[PDB]
Amino acid sequence: EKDFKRYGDALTKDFLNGYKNDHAKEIVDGFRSDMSIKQLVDLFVKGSWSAEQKGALAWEIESRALKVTFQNKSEKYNRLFREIASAGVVDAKATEQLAPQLMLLNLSNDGFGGRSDPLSKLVLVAKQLENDGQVGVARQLLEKMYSAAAVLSNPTLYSDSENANASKLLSSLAAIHAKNPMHDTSMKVWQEKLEGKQALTVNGVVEKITDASANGKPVLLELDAPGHAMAAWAKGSGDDRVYGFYDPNAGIVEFSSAEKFGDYLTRFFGKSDLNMAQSYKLGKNDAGEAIFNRVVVMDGNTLASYKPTFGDKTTMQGILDLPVFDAT
Secondary structure, eight states, X not given: OHHHHHHHHOOOHHHHHHHHTSXXXXXXXXXXXXXXXXXXXXXXXXXXXXXXXXXXXXXXXHHHHHHHHHHGGGHHHHHHHHHHHXXXXXXXXXXXXXXXXXXXXXXXXXXSSSOHHHHHHHHHHHHHHHHTTOOSHHXXXXXXXXXXXXXXXXXXXXXHHHHHHHXXXXXXXXXXXXXXXXXXXXXXXXXXXXXXXXXXXXXXXXXXXXXXXXXXXXXXXXXXXXXXXXXXXXXXXXXXXXXXXXXXXXXXXXXXXXXXXXXXXXXXXXXXXXXXXXXXXXXXXXXXXXXXXXXXXXXXXXXXXXXXXXXXXXXXXXXXTOOSSOOX
């Protein structure tokens, strides 16, 4: 552990700024969200970094440790239970169900991060299904993320099958990332790909979504920044027509007012308010306006039927119907 004592030594107003705001993805090339504390310490000393970048790696390390600090408050009961269960006679019904008083749920990591693309695509499938008459399917996906995290964080309170449900959810996301429907070799998931000289800005996206000519028909866009995927959609008819945005790092907004949808996206990406074009590092078209690298117009019925895992019937629609909790 010379790694750790060397981290120690080389350990400021840019630091604080890296720690809080300048997050490591985006500004520390080679940071991956699936990295352990051991691996992030490796990357810290191994490399040469600005005080911002150190700040950001420090947050990635310390945020992870914090989670465990809270988990370890259960450990003295865990340890007692294990000394007793695993000494002397065998008790097939020896069980503990821990009740921690604090739990830190971090959806950026322990296999919850790096999934903006699979989540975007799944939310789009959900919106197609909602367009077709189902209710609350995208919401129920996001809810399932929080529930799965709780389960994996505190497994002893949940059944075996619930622990396996939660894992299966995460491995479903990994599978979608592993075998992207955009780089496929059998079927076509999309209607079109707008990039290069047809690349859309935020305003174009606003228009492709709120266009009067699409009235009564779903519109299902994946929005790709350099390292990050988002979704937008329109669904329903007339008064029930709705326009929506989903950033995996933020949540979902919906409006029936096109103006309101347009102002949200404009102020979300633009420098007037949240400045997300810069912080997701969107490139610029010939006029200097922020564009997405790619906007994919999606065929919702065909994306709903896509199977991301070889030798497994589970479609995207199926992945949306995966439980975390055991059925009632």
